[PDB]
Design an enzyme around this catalytic site. Structure first.
Site, short mmCIF file in Angstrom:
data_model
loop_
_atom_site.label_atom_id
_atom_site.label_comp_id
_atom_site.label_asym_id
_atom_site.label_seq_id
_atom_site.Cartn_x
_atom_site.Cartn_y
_atom_site.Cartn_z
CB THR A 138 43.09 35.67 41.16
OG1 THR A 138 42.68 34.41 41.71
CG2 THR A 138 43.72 35.44 39.79
CB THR A 139 47.36 33.49 44.09
OG1 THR A 139 47.99 34.78 44.06
CG2 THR A 139 48.41 32.40 43.94
CE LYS A 164 39.91 35.11 38.26
NZ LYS A 164 40.38 36.47 38.65
N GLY A 171 49.38 33.64 39.13
CA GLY A 171 48.93 34.85 39.81
C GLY A 171 50.03 35.58 40.55
CB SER A 172 49.70 38.80 42.36
OG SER A 172 48.71 39.27 41.46
#
Lengths: 234, 220, 217, 247, 218, 142, 202, 99, 233, 163
Positions: C56-57, C71, C168-169
């Site tokens: 997730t970002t 989320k 996040g990623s």
């Protein structure tokens, strides 16, 4: 007069051994409304005349259910009735959870007897001031117990508690020979109970709102009839 | 029926709390006045002056009292501890309503047992919420009742000073300037001086014992 | 006395003497469902943490119109929480936080400060710090006094405020692409565009307003 | 039930009733007295017995608190016994176990006074119905004599007496005391005062007397640590007391 | 002392439109030894709720007994009100997370109908994350059970032939039952733990039905 | 009938387990200012790697007392432990003293500790919440 | 676990249940204590067979006598439910009873009762149950006599008994901790409980 | 009711929200009313948290009365409350109802 | 109403605390005087007799710390309980902040202790009032008193015990705040000499101390006698 | 990173956080996330409570003694968390700056400078301008090896944009 000195607590006897403070809690039942209970060998029935505080108010819930096998009737102090009912139902539950056995009605009554006795002897609390009628059906058949807040329990074919219970109890005493044989025809036992509670009425008549009924038996889990369900029996 | 907190009078009074209010009635007089922009609080030879009855509980909220001094000092200490505990657990400074609610809860808590004496003190709580500029003034009572007031007086002469305020205050033309609030306060006191002015954004001044207002009001 | 006596009068072996056990097994009523701060079982050993170990970002920034998050647990109609870390821990502790917020708002009759809510969260997470509770909820809202407010909260109990949070990623790509465009004085739809561009550079929108948060799909 | 109201309270006069009644119980008790000499302290009392069949050797009214400190009382013997037990225990726990040495008399007296005072605040107990004369020696304060009352007040005395004879004994001591007494002179004055205070048979078996004096290495029970100090408290035997009475 | 074990076996929740299916094998395992061929792994909890705590058998029994007791208390307190499936899920969540640091070593699934009467399935992490789901397999052969059903109730990675997606279909309750049957047959054919029998609970607006089907005994 | 204290570890932990020290703002978290323990930093999770002896030495006397009551129940019946416990609770509940650390003189007699010392006797071992009022509130449960 | 009990084996039959145990407690490899009876009848209608730690065995046997003494103020199912609850709560206390227990009996309605429980609280029914080494060697032999619950009405008491004796013989052949002496109990709905002490493999 | 015209009527608060569909009006010793309302609010929020469901008004007033019991056996309080509560709300079970 | 300290009377007054106050009217007078360059403390030893060890009866003046002393009137047992509590508090403060306790913080702690015993029903008020003399670098020399009620006040000169009204009148006439310690010693001695119920203010009937310069001295009876004859009593 | 310099007129503190303990007293700290800031804010709340109760600033020496005691009391119950604290304050009574460092074990020492080079530069007689220049030099050498800046003064605490 002198009663005023020796009646302040459950911990002083009088010079005559009376223990007035328990007597006053037994008189507290006479302030309750009448309820009748009776049983045959196969079925047990409770009948109760409910009351309401005012014409704008609903009628108070006078009968309860420990489980699918046993139930209870109240007369007297509402707070103590609440306490004892919660206690009797927390014992019925713990019994089922730990042993997976329906708590014997007689055992439940003895548990109430024990709980009630404690308050009669310690200084700080007070006697429960509430009478209870317990009915149930188990391996031993139909049961009716009368509980008095002195901590006395008796198994009876029929009884009444509350303000004018003496009338209904006198009527039942004349007729026990008839209702105990009413086996497999519970409708006639319910109608006999409503007749018994038709005595002891004063300025009042039985109505679908003020009258409540419950029944349990070999073929019948504990069911409560109130409101329009009672019109079958009025 | 007088001799315990647990006992209702047959007419429903708890006399032991009314006797604590009578204990308040003997304490030295405290006055409070809300303006539009401020709240004003006011009240032997060999005394050592250097070592005020108005006690800061936090930079934005102030507590005055009347009644038993030692009880008041204990309740002030507890209020200060609660103010700092809130400011630690939550980032925001206490609401003035939150503080007065806590104080009234403490006073109530000391009413919930016959083995403890209730605090024989009434408090006047004045201040401003953080990042807010509505002036708030509250009274607490020995019972732990609390109420919001535009002006109030407690203690020895609270009757006459309150009957004065009830006519010299106007609910819809309140004093709209700091000097006007101080004037009304001193006037109310002069019916029977120390003055404290609390202003928004944690600004509080003990007003220097300026007798000018006294002389002006005596001229009037 | 009698209470003392009855202490000396089969229930010991299955431990249904223990009141908290009776509650946990719902013998003594439903009281387990009547307590705030739900009680958590710990293994009765000298090294509970060892037994536990042996078991997730998303983006936000403050701007003229409020905050856009891109989320997201609906803690309240005015508070949003980015579920991050263990999903079970997030779902549970954010629901508990929402209940604490509801209680605060009831008692005080104001919308809770986002600072206050984030502090409550960080304090509770700290209290369980070192036992599970993998957690990274970024807390976002608007309050009339505070205005747009952002706080990150961590399993380690970090609490930090800032105008931009990238997590996040692709967080470094999102941050780089945003900083090339970010402004305070963005127009509403302009901020929505810059947000979508920065999420797309890192491949939901939520618009946060004084009258609550809004979802823009 | 979480609270018990205070049994001792101020009267409108400002006097704490139970303290006055404990001091009255002390006044009712049999005479005891003590006397500082320059080189010791005497404490003495009557062994009143309820029968001649009682074993006087078990009527220990005088008791050692430390090798350098002893106590006597008037009033409720059971209270004195419990106070002695507690004072010994506190002398060990508070002081000997911390500093490796026995407390000075001043501080053990202060500890006893603290114990007695707290019975005056409690709502569970009455105060103790005894006053204690505590005599002792300290390396720095020297010989000292304190009187502790049911209130837990204490004062240092040159000589004092408590119980029925208290006033007449205190007058006899005030006329006969002087700053130059030797311990044998103090013992003689003590015996004469008690002879004047006692009721009925005055003999070495109806009295007991203890002294704080020089160390008694023959009471130490071991030999070979030359810096180690024999007890200074010494109870006189009824033989020795009779040999005094023949003076 | 290790307070956990693996008792094997598998469970499968399927949500329909007006139904939900919960199926599980009835074999009980320890190591390579068959403990029994018929333990009922799935339970009617009343209120049209069916439940199974798959995983460690003892913790599953404990959790389902605590749940049933909690339902009893819910009825006592709320005068026999039907517990809603979402309220049941929240209850089971709080039961699970109360063990957060000594968790029930089980994956549990409940199936029911929501207030719309729509088929509902919920599955819970042993520490009590949960989701509304249309289907969920669990247990050792879940990886065998699920992809086939995700290929037969859904049509994922299928296309209309030569038109390089074919639309999904609603299924009758008996047709999904037959797909559960075939899936568990394939899994018992290929996974040694998938039991000797298949017991299927069918939740419908009429109530719960129990069905049992034999599977290979080896 | 125990010699060494067996039941010696908390089975359940909660942020609210510690009562009388809870935050008034949020009645679910400790009051780290009133705790005066050096912040939240003594978080309850840090109750780990306890000394093996500590969990037995703290409650050794309690275990000895429980064994003694059990022995009295076995040999003398329910009356004797009841009497002992009632006496002990009367003593404990009537001795209130917020200033003294010392044990009650009668408590020692009942415990038969008149002529006994232990390290708890020899070594009997704050800006907030140390006041007499905090002790009053603890004792009355205000 | 110091002194351990070898293994319990049992099966249900047309009119009842059979249970057997080898009456031996081993001190590790030392066959220290003989005559350790491990079948505990709990009233007329059930026998609790216990294996593993003999000290924990004697603690569960006194829990069962306590249960009977209180009931005197039972179905097999109630005794089992209590046992299983104790076992599981001891597990969760991290203080297990190092035992595996089979509660065998007949319900008052006449249903045969067999449940296994172990120190973990793992529970299961079957036509045949065995503990420890009996679960690997004896269970295959008993499952040849009653493989499925439709075989129960086909299985006479004589055949079930001969099967149990054969399985005990095989255990004695192949279990190093087995004794030659064993006890066997038959709980029959018609004839009640027959408890044959001190049988020998022959 | 106002003791004096200087009392701010906008802060008397004799009616309070307990939950989104349940309100309560006080009369009597306001301190006890505050304690009952805090209890009722805690009960309501807890029931929401644990059951994902707003409390039935009957169950709420039952909890409130269960509190009022605790001057005797369920003791917590030296005396009964000096306050009556008039609890009004709506629920999907019984609709608009007043207790 | 007076039976227990936790009951308000109908007049709203706590008779038990007024009786604890009245208990001090029977304690021998203590007096304290703050000068430009120090503080004087003096007290009457009303309990006196020739068999008492006057040389070691330090019995009304107690140092709680360096730079702080208390004069005691009332129940000496309660006095020494509170004195030891205050000593422990002062040493805890020094241990925590490495600075000498401010005098007012100690007075406040002791007054809160005395107050609490008026608020729990199983405790009686302490039948004792202290005068506190001390020095700190915030307020310099400062002098306080506190009552059984647990209220306290700062004073330039104060008297407590039996004849407090007379002593305080003599202070109010004769006190001037630019006097020196040597002047305040003589003003204290004059006040006590005119206040005492004794026929004469013999040195054994006095206890005397000063805080000045920072050093504190509790006078031995020799220098007490010398200060007396220097004053001319 | 934290850094501090005691000058003839001021205390200069620098960090790559900080809490104001009183108008003339500043605290800066470094260490484990959460533990360090929970400690610093408990300390801040305590010093604020003292300042309110007394209506008087606690001196910097007493503040640093309190922080030392609270840190030692924090460690006693649990594993030592890594923390280091610089407390810079102006003592309005002695009318001079003071700087204290407290290590993760509660070892407290008064220092002319500290951090968590300058011996070739630091002079006790420096002015705050010389101190800010020495700070610039030190940061320049730090960036060679691989800030917020505060001043404590008679006029209180000051932010410096010349980072």
């Amino acid at each position: 007069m002198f009663r005023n000195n020796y009646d302040g607590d459950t911990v002083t006897f009088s010079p005559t051994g009376r223990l007035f403070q328990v007597e006053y809690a037994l008189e507290a039942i006479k302030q309750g409304s009448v309820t009748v209970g009776l049983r045959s060998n196969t079925h047990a029935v409770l009948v109760a005349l409910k009351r309401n505080a005012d014409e704008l108010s609903s009628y108070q819930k006078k009968i309860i259910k420990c489980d699918e096998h046993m139930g209870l009737s109240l007369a007297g102090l509402a707070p103590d009735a609440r306490v004892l009912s919660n206690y009797l139902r927390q014992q019925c539950n713990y019994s089922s959870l730990v042993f997976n056995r329906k708590l014997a009605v007689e055992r439940a009554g003895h548990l109430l007897c024990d709980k009630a006795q404690k308050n009669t002897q310690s200084y700080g609390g007070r006697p429960y001031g509430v009478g209870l009628l317990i009915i149930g059906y188990d391996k031993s058949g139909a049961h009716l117990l009368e509980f008095q807040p002195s901590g006395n329990v008796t198994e009876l074919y029929g009884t009444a508690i509350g303000a004018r219970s003496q009338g209904a109890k006198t009527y039942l005493e004349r007729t026990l020979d008839t209702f105990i044989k009413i086996d497999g025809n519970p409708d006639e036992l319910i109608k006999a109970g409503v007749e018994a509670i038709s005595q002891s009425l004063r300025d009042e008549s039985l109505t679908v709102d003020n009258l409540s009924i419950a029944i349990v038996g070999k073929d019948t889990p504990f069911t409560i009839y109130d409101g329009e369900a009672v019109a079958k029996y009025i | 029926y007088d001799r315990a907190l647990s006992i209702f009078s047959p007419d429903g009074h708890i006399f032991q709390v009314e006797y604590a209010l009578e204990a308040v009635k003997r304490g030295t007089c405290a006055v409070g006045v809300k303006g539009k922009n401020c709240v004003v609080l006011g009240c032997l030879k060999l005394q050592d002056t250097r070592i005020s009855k108005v006690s800061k509980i936090d930079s934005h909220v102030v507590l005055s009292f009347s009644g038993l001094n030692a009880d008041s000092r204990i309740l002030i200490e507890k209020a200060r501890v609660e103010a700092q505990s809130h400011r630690l657990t939550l980032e925001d400074p206490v609401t003035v309503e939150y503080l007065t609610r806590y104080v009234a809860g403490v006073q109530q808590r000391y009413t919930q047992s016959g083995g403890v004496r209730p605090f024989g003190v009434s408090t006047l709580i004045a201040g401003f919420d953080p990042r807010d500029d509505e002036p708030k003034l509250y009274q607490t009572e020995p019972s732990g009742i609390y109420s919001s007031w535009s002006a109030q007086t407690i203690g020895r002469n609270s009757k006459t000073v309150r009957e004065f305020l009830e006519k010299n205050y106007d609910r819809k033309e309140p004093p709209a300037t700091v000097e006007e609030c101080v004037k009304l306060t001193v006037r109310s006191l002069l019916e029977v001086i120390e003055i404290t002015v609390v202003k928004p954004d944690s600004d509080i001044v003990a007003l220097s014992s300026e007798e000018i207002n006294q002389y002006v009001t005596q001229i009037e | 006395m009698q209470a003392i006596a009855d202490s000396f009068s089969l229930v010991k072996e299955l431990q249904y003497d223990n009141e908290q056990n009776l509650e946990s097994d719902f013998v003594t009523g439903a009281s387990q469902f009547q307590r705030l701060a739900p009680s958590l079982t710990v293994p009765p050993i000298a090294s509970p943490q060892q037994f536990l170990r042996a078991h997730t970002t998303t983006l936000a920034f403050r701007f003229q119109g409020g905050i856009i998050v891109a989320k997201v647990i609906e803690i309240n109609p005015f508070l949003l929480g980015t579920m991050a870390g263990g999903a079970a821990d997030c779902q549970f502790w954010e629901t508990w936080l929402g209940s604490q917020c509801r209680l605060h708002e009831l008692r005080e009759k104001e919308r809770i400060s986002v600072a206050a809510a984030s502090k409550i969260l960080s304090n509770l997470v700290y209290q369980y710090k070192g036992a599970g509770l993998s957690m990274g909820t970024m807390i976002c809202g608007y309050t009339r006094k505070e205005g747009p407010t952002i706080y990150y909260v961590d399993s380690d109990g970090t609490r930090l405020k800032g105008d931009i949070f990238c997590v996040g990623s692709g967080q470094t790509f999102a941050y780089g692409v945003l900083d090339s465009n970010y402004k305070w004085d963005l127009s509403v739809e302009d901020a929505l565009y810059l947000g979508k561009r920065s999420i797309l550079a890192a491949a939901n929108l939520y618009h946060v307003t004084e009258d609550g948060w809004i979802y823009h799909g | 039930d979480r609270y018990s109201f205070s049994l001792t309270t101020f009267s409108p006069s400002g006097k704490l009733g139970q303290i006055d009644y404990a001091l009255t119980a002390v006044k009712q008790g049999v005479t005891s007295l003590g006397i500082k000499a320059t080189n010791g302290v005497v404490i003495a009392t009557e062994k009143k017995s309820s029968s001649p069949l009682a074993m006087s050797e078990t009527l220990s009214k005088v008791s050692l608190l430390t090798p350098d400190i002893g106590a006597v009382y008037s009033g409720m013997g059971p209270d004195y016994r419990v106070l002695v037990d507690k004072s010994r225990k506190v002398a060990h726990t508070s002081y000997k176990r911390i500093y490796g040495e026995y407390p000075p008399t001043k501080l053990l007296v202060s500890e006893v006074a603290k114990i007695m005072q707290e019975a005056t605040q409690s709502g569970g107990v009455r105060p103790f119905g005894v006053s204690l004369l505590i005599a002792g020696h300290d390396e720095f304060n020297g010989f000292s004599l304190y009187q502790v009352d049911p209130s837990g007040s204490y004062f240092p005395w040159k000589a004092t007496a408590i119980g029925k004879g208290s006033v007449a004994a205190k007058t006899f001591l005030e006329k006969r005391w002087n700053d130059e007494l030797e311990l044998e002179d103090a013992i003689h004055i003590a015996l004469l005062t008690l002879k004047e205070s006692v009721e009925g048979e005055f003999n070495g078996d109806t009295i007991e007397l203890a002294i704080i004096g020089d160390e008694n290495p023959d009471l130490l029970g071991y030999t070979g640590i030359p810096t180690d100090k024999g007890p200074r408290f010494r109870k006189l035997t009824s033989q020795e007391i009779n040999d005094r009475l023949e003076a | 002392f290790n307070p956990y074990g693996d008792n094997g076996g598998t469970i499968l929740g399927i949500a329909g439109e007006d139904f939900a299916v919960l199926a599980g094998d009835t074999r009980n395992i320890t190591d390579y030894s068959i403990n029994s061929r018929y333990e009922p792994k799935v339970f009617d909890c009343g209120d049209n709720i069916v439940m199974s705590a798959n995983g460690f058998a003892a913790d599953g029994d404990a959790l389902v007994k605590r749940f049933k007791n909690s339902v009893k208390w819910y009825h006592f307190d709320h005068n026999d009100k039907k517990l809603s499936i979402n309220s049941a899920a929240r209850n089971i969540q709080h039961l699970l997370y109360g063990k957060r640091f000594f968790p029930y070593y089980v994956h549990t699934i409940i199936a029911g109908l929501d207030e719309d009467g729509k088929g509902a399935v919920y599955s819970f992490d042993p520490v009590g994350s949960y989701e509304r789901e249309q289907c969920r397999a669990g247990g050792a052969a879940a990886s065998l059970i699920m992809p086939f059903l995700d290929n037969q109730v859904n049509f994922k990675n299928q296309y209309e032939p030569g038109t390089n997606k074919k639309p999904l279909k609603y299924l009758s309750v008996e047709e999904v039952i037959k797909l559960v049957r075939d899936s568990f047959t394939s899994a018992t054919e290929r996974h040694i733990q998938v039991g000797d029998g298949l017991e299927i609970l069918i939740v419908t607006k009429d109530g719960v039905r129990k069905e049992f089907y034999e599977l290979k005994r080896d | 009938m125990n010699i060494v204290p067996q039941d010696t570890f908390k089975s359940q932990v909660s942020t609210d387990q510690d009562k009388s020290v809870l935050s008034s703002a949020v009645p679910s978290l400790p009051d780290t200012l009133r705790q005066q323990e050096g912040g939240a930093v003594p978080l309850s999770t840090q109750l780990n790697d306890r000394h093996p002896l500590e969990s037995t030495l703290k409650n050794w006397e309690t275990t000895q007392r429980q064994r003694q009551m059990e022995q009295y129940r076995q040999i003398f019946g329910i009356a004797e432990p009841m009497k002992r416990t009632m006496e002990m609770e009367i003593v404990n509940r009537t001795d209130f003293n917020p200033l003294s650390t010392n044990g009650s003189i009668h408590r020692d007699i009942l415990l038969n500790k008149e002529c006994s010392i232990d390290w708890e006797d020899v070594y009997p071992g704050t800006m907030v919440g140390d006041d007499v009022h905090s002790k009053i509130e603890k004792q009355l449960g205000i | 676990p110091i002194v351990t009990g070898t293994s319990v084996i049992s099966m249900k039959y047309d009119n009842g249940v059979i249970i057997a145990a080898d009456n031996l407690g081993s001190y590790g490899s030392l066959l220290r204590f003989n005559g350790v009876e491990r079948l505990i009848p709990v009233g007329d209608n059930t026998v609790v067979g216990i294996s593993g730690d003999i000290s924990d065995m004697q603690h569960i046997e006194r829990l069962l006598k306590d249960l009977v003494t209180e009931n005197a103020y039972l179905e097999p199912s109630y005794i089992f439910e209590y046992l299983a609850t104790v076992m599981y709560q001891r597990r969760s206390k991290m203080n297990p009873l190092w035992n595996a227990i089979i509660v065998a009996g007949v319900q008052s309605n006449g249903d045969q009762f067999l449940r296994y429980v172990n120190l973990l609280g793992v529970t299961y029914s079957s036509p045949t149950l065995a503990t420890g080494f009996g679960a690997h060697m004896a269970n295959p032999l008993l499952r040849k006599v009653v493989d499925r619950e439709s075989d129960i009405p086909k299985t006479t008491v004589q055949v079930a008994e001969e099967a149990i004796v054969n399985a005990m013989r095989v255990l004695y052949y192949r279990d190093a901790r087995s004794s030659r002496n064993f006890s066997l109990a038959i709980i029959d709905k018609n004839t009640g409980l027959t408890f044959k002490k001190n049988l020998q493999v022959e | 009711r106002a003791t004096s015209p200087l009392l701010e009527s906008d802060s008397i608060e004799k009616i309070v929200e307990i939950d989104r569909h349940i309100g309560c009006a006080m009369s009597g010793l306001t301190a006890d009313a505050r304690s009952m309302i805090e209890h009722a609010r805690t009960a309501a929020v807890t029931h929401n948290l644990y059951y994902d469901e707003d409390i039935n008004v009957e169950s709420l007033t039952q909890s409130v009365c269960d509190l009022a019991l605790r001057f005797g056996e369920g003791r917590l309080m030296s005396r009964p409350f000096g306050v009556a509560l008039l609890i009004a709300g709506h629920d999907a079970d019984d609709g608009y109802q007043l207790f | 109403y007076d039976s227990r300290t936790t009951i308000f009377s109908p007049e709203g007054r706590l008779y038990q605390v007024e009786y604890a106050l009245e208990s001090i009217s029977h304690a021998g007078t203590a007096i304290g005087i703050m000068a430009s360059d120090g503080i004087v403390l003096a007290a009457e030893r009303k309990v006196t007799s020739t068999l008492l060890e006057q040389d070691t009866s330090t019995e009304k003046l107690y140092k709680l710390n360096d730079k702080i002393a208390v004069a005691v009137a009332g129940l000496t047992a309660d006095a020494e309980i509170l004195i030891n509590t205050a000593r422990i508090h002062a040493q805890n403060y020094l241990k925590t902040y490495n600075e000498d306790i401010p005098v007012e913080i100690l007075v406040r702690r002791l007054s809160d202790i005395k107050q609490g015993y008026t608020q729990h029903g199983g405790l009686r008020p302490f039948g004792v009032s202290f005068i506190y003399a001390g020095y700190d670098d915030r307020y310099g020399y400062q002098l306080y008193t506190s009552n059984p009620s647990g209220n306290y006040t700062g004073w330039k000169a104060i008297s407590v015990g039996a004849n407090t009204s007379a002593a305080q009148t003599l202070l109010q006439m004769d006190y001037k705040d630019d006097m020196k310690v040597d002047d305040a010693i003589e003003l204290a001695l004059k006040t006590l000499s005119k206040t005492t119920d004794s026929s004469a203010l013999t040195y054994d009937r006095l206890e005397f101390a000063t805080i000045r310069k920072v050093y504190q001295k509790i006078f031995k009876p020799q220098e007490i006698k010398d200060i007396l004859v220097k004053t001319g009593i | 990173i934290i850094l501090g310099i005691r000058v003839q007129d001021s205390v200069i503190l620098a960090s790559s956080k900080t809490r104001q303990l009183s108008p003339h007293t500043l605290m800066s700290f470094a260490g484990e996330a959460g533990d360090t800031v929970q400690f610093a804010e408990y300390i801040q709340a305590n010093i604020q409570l003292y300042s309110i109760r007394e209506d008087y600033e606690l001196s910097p020496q007493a503040v640093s003694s309190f922080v030392r005691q609270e840190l030692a009391k924090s460690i006693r119950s649990r594993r030592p968390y890594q923390v280091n604290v610089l407390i810079g304050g102006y003592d309005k009574k002695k009318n001079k700056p003071e700087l204290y460092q407290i290590d993760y074990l509660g070892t407290k020492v008064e220092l002319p400078y500290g951090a968590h080079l300058l011996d070739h530069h630091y002079r006790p007689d420096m002015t705050t301008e010389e101190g800010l220049d020495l700070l610039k030099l030190c940061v320049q050498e730090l960036e060679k090896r691989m800030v917020i800046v505060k001043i404590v003064d008679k006029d209180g605490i000051r932010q410096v944009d010349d980072f």
